[PDB]
UniProtKB/Swiss-Prot annotation, chains A, B:
Keywords: Acyltransferase, Cytoplasm, Fatty acid biosynthesis, Fatty acid metabolism, Lipid biosynthesis, Lipid metabolism, Transferase. Pathway: Lipid metabolism; fatty acid biosynthesis. One of its GO terms (molecular function) is 3-oxoacyl-[acyl-carrier-protein] synthase activity. It comes from Escherichia coli O6:H1 (strain CFT073 / ATCC 700928 / UPEC). This is 3-oxoacyl-[acyl-carrier-protein] synthase 1. It is found in: Cytoplasm. The active site is at C163 (for beta-ketoacyl synthase activity), E298 (for beta-ketoacyl synthase activity), H333 (for beta-ketoacyl synthase activity). NCBIfam families: PRK07967.1 (NF005935). GO terms for biological process: fatty acid biosynthetic process.
Length: 405, 405
């Protein structure tokens, strides 16, 4: 069937507002985590986060941004970048039935859902709520707020799957190409950063709380003293395009998506089973006869999660353990946006020939012994890379990207 | 490619807690709309809704329901019904890599999102919030909360697209079968009903507010005196299965999904363009050699929406107009769950050979000129039915179902 390639990327993350800033951060192992007075003032135990360092004010037309929440704003800016990077003119992707968009978020906008409820209970009621809360709070906000302004005429919807969200968006975009239904599909996601959402994770003990005095060291995937993930926000978008279509217009191709896995654990609501991830990676590797040169793990920096994933990796590769690094150690967990941002970090490593370090490992977990966990920036000619995304509800997604000749 | 059929269904709506109660309501043209003290007390102008009349207490095991919000609860009950109706047992669908689930909601859980923030802001903080809010508030709540307890091992994620949500879930399930990736996929969705979410629509002016004294007459699609939709809650689930697999086990087949359309308006954020709807219906009709006998339109019961759809239908069919009925006139708008519930209402009409009536039409709109709008339960031998679902962000979905030869 049809082949799908990535011809453009865009990103707004805690470690950079474009692919160049991100490239630099990755090579330097630079942390994007900072102290958050907002989280502390909210009464949380976790006082750190991967915030987007950028004032989005005035970057989007007023009549457009009025319907958007932060998730949508980050994704929108990422898409603008992706379009430019892919070299697509308005006439090339706009008002085109064969051009679609699949992008989502993990929780829509808790901030605006809370805003509406707070306003409604106030002295003004409906007048305080305003007529723009629905498009900001609905789960499809990220896709609705981008499809409309970018004049998308093809597929238009969001895939939501907790922390695997934007990973499934990319995979579904590949499926549209494979089914011959679309020539181009913009795929990615976004996630806002706020105490309204973060506190829920702290209430279940999922966030790091013992490193508030040293923010850049809180996220420490694979470290014996890890104590939870560091929440983050941001966005990402990639241009998934049919191969022949990309070649015909002389598009720059980062890589082909040669493998996409999507499975379910059918076990625990918030803890990974490991068994599902094994099937997910194996599914993504079906027909891929080239070895995996680098694996961008889920590496949440949680006690149980990091362990279950290393076990799954051992089962899949055994004595064929590939190089591994967890970028979340420096970026934090952007939840719904993690999938696309991590695929982008992987594409950058593949494009520039290097492996980003898995930082903050002062004492390697005993269950990670024997694995090839890269802890220092290492230059290397990569050809095939893998990126895993796992979320609550036992949802698993894996993407395999490979350079073209 | 492979063919997909519906071998089972389950539903929990304002007009019935199962397919029998729904069938009884559709035949009688009974309304599920009632006066809501909750909405009135919140300060809203709309005082009516299509609530689920069912005491869900004790219907789901304690350990499982503790992670669920109302949208998940409704979808869960619908899935239990669908499994039994399909004649499937644990040994056949559990722990099976070729059995998946695609189901979502329009906005996760505004109630628990607000509950979390309210609790956190209280003197107890994190202790008051509890450790179960994430799975209740996240957008993928519906898929996560069903795939886990039902031990699903295949595909697992939610698709969100506002009022087209559950319609795209079904379409995506069909795609999994066509790609040969799954033999069975449970598809559908659910949506909670609460002022927290309802007030956002009211502040938007999208809800009916001139018939609070006569609830059952508030939702009046195509009526010249319509003034917005009536919000509703509920769930729905259908079993999408590969044809040979279904025939091999001697399953009961309601109909085959012979058409699926998914397009984008790329125009207005909250108003339909019509142009997108035309392309969507045409896409679903492509290849169908049989004419459309019945059409379960979107019929939101809104001034602009109704007009735009009628025009689109007129553009697609023209003189050869099929029987048209807007079930939302009696059920209300269940948003994220509207797609699957309407697909179900249509399957029941096709299964029981009859057309549901479009109630509350005291004065037909000028736009519905040369169109066959059924306003009374009519017995007919339907063969091919169509259902349209449109949502904010200009997202369109259309499903075409036909009896198996
Ligand atoms: C990743 O799997 C962890 C869960 C992320 C879900 C997306 C964010 C939902 C938060 C909603 C408010 C509690
Ligand atoms: C249908 O298109 C109208 C919009 C429905 C959006 C999904 C329902 C939830 C909206 C946000 C609630 C906080
Ligand atoms: N990853």
């Amino acid at each position: 069937m049809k082949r799908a390639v990535i011809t453009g990327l865009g990103i707004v993350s805690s470690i950079g507002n474009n692919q160049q800033e991100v490239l630099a951060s990755l090579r330097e192992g630079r942390s994007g985590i900072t102290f958050s007075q907002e989280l502390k003032d909210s009464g949380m135990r976790s006082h750190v986060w991967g915030n987007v360092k950028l004032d989005t004010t005035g970057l989007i037309d007023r009549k457009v941004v009025r319907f958007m929440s932060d998730a949508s704003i980050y994704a929108f800016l990422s898409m603008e970048q992706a379009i430019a990077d892919a070299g697509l003119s308005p006439e090339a992707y706009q008002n085109n039935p064969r051009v679609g968009l699949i992008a989502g978020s993990g929780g829509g906008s808790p901030r605006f859902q809370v805003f509406g409820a707070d306003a409604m209970r106030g002295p003004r009621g409906l007048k305080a709520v305003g007529p723009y809360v629905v498009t900001k709070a609905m789960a499809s906000g990220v896709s609705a707020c981008l499809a409309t302004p970018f004049k998308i005429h093809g597929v238009n919807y969001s895939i939501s799957s907790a922390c695997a969200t934007s990973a499934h968006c990319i995979g579904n975009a590949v499926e549209q190409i494979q089914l011959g239904k679309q020539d181009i599909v913009f795929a990615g996601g976004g996630e806002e950063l706020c105490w309204e959402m973060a506190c829920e994770f702290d209430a279940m003990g999922a966030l790091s709380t013992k490193y508030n005095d040293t923010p850049e060291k809180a996220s420490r995937t694979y470290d014996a003293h890890r104590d939870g993930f560091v929440i983050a926000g941001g966005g990402g978008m990639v241009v998934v395009e049919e191969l022949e279509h990309a070649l015909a217009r002389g598009a720059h191709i980062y890589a082909e998506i040669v493998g996409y896995g999507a499975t379910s654990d059918g076990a625990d609501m918030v803890a990974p089973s490991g068994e599902g991830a094994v099937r997910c990676m194996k599914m993504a590797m079906h027909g891929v006869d080239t070895p995996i040169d680098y694996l961008n793990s889920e590496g949440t920096s949680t006690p149980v999660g990091d362990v279950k994933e290393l076990a799954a990796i051992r089962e899949v590769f055994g004595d064929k353990s590939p190089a591994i690094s967890a970028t979340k150690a420096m970026t934090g967990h952007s939840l719904g946006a993690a999938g696309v941002q991590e695929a982008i970090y992987s594409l950058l490593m593949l494009e520039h020939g290097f492996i980003a370090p898995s930082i903050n490992i002062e004492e390697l977990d005993e269950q990670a012994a024997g694995l090839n966990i890269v802890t220092e920036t290492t230059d290397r000619e990569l050809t095939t890379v893998m990126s895993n995304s796992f979320g609550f509800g036992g949802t698993n997604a894996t993407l395999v990207m490979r350079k073209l000749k």
